Copies of this chain bind each other. A is one copy, B any other.
Amino acid sequence: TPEMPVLENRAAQGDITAPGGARRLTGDQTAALRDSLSDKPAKNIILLIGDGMGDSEITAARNYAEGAGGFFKGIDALPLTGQYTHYALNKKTGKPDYVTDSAASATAWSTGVKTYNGALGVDIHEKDHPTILEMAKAAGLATGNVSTAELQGATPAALVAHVTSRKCYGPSATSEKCPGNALEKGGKGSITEQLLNARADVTLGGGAKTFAETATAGEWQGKTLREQAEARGYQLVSDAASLNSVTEANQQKPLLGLFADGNMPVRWLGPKATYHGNIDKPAVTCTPNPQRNDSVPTLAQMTDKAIELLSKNEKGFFLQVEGASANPCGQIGETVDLDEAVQRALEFAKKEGNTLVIVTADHAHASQIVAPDTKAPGLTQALNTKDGAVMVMSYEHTGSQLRIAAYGPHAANVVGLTDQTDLFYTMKAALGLK
């Protein structure tokens, strides 16, 4: 039965200077697309999120790494595409707030309810709403959360924590900034304490710093959150070797991989963009970061490991993978990173035939690709792309709708204009979560 093609090749087909040369299509999509459509139940969902990765950021990364007529074998290979909205709510008025932050957006797709800038897992009345991971887990499904940023960061945090502020990282900052959530005040705990209670089968990322914090109440008081994790049965892993030896990870043995104190390392380094840096400075070539290491797993590696462990669950799985860390090279390199994770996800999804893979961003950032002769009011940098031509980028969250792309069962629900909260109901209905 015609089981779902991925976009094969959408690179410029020939000589870009010639008629028909820059075409990305070799024919008519109608029947490929017809076979891309299935409404049958998604057994697994993999959701890949690029921090700030709107259309402008995908274009600049393609231009740099693949060349303008190039194609990301992961990000651009998803057959169903649409645009979605992500406005937040002003807390006092409940009126729309056109420019969201990462917390409210992360909340909108994990719980399906709009909230205010700064909130995680709570609506504007500070009430908690259940996340898609809490719900997958309640249904007996394996669950995993992966990031290259701090695990306390808004996108990973929003699946496991419910606090009135994204800053309530650990006990210290919670007593002070989220009193109603402070464990001492009967609240549910900080983002890191709620993480530990939440017991996702696979959690992997940065942010080991706040795990050194110590509990102020509860049966693990005085112990640090790392000690509590181990005390609760988590198998901790802190490099690529240990992650690779892990054979099983489940509710009896939750894997928790902490690979960086803050954010895990950035793939490429470059100079900072400067005022008139395109006029007054050379075109940049990005340097691979020497200090990324064979000890530190990559986002693609974490993704593949997580898929390996989570797929042993005979009921299905949910997995969120976040690709996060005026530095254009570091920006572009993280989109390359994520593309490799999407690729792996698609590799699994095609083979399995019952996985919805979704790639999108939390919200748009402010860089634009601009004409190389520009006198911007800002920070620019000219870059040497794959094409041997220079691209100037110019430099903060923005409110623009952005791309969401999908492959697999129920992916039709991302085509057209949707809203970020619809993603929760799409995933929930795909997974049959009742």
Contact = CB atoms under 8 A, between A and B. Distances in A.
Contacts of A68: 85, 87, 96, 98
A63 interface: yes
Contact of A369 (B99, B114, B374): B99
Contact of A416 (B38, B79, B85, B374): B79
B95 A425 contact: no
A366 B368 contact: yes
Interface string A184-204: 000000000000000000000
Interface string A416-434: 1111011001100100000
A270 interface: no
A241 interface: no
Contact of A25 (B16, B58, B418): B418
A401 B60 CA distance: 9
Contacts of A413: 25, 28-30
A225 interface: no
Chain A facing B: main interface SS = loop
Interface in A11-31: 12, 16-25, 28-31
Interface stretch (A139-147, A252-260, A349-357, A389-397): A389-397
A22 B420 CA distance: 9
B85 A83 contact: no
A67 B39 contact: no
B16 A94 contact: yes
Contacts of A82: 81
Q: How many copies does the complex hold?
A: 2
A22 B410 CA distance: 20
A396 B415 contact: no
Given A28-B39, A28-B413, A389 B98 contact: yes
Contacts of A227: none
A420 to B, nearest CB: 8
A17 B378 contact: no
A10 interface: yes
User: Which 9 residue pairs across A and B have the least CB separation, nearest first?
Assistant: A369-B399, A377-B377, A68-B96, A56-B400, A30-B39, A368-B398, A68-B87, A30-B412, A95-B389
A76 interface: yes
Interface residues of A, number: 97
Contacts of A422: 23-25
Given A55-B400, A371-B99, A20 B425 contact: yes
Nearest to A393: B399
Most buried by B among A7, A80, A111: A80
Interface in A55-84: 55-56, 58-60, 63, 67-69, 71, 76, 78-83
Nearest to A56: B400
B16 A89 contact: yes
B398 A63 contact: no
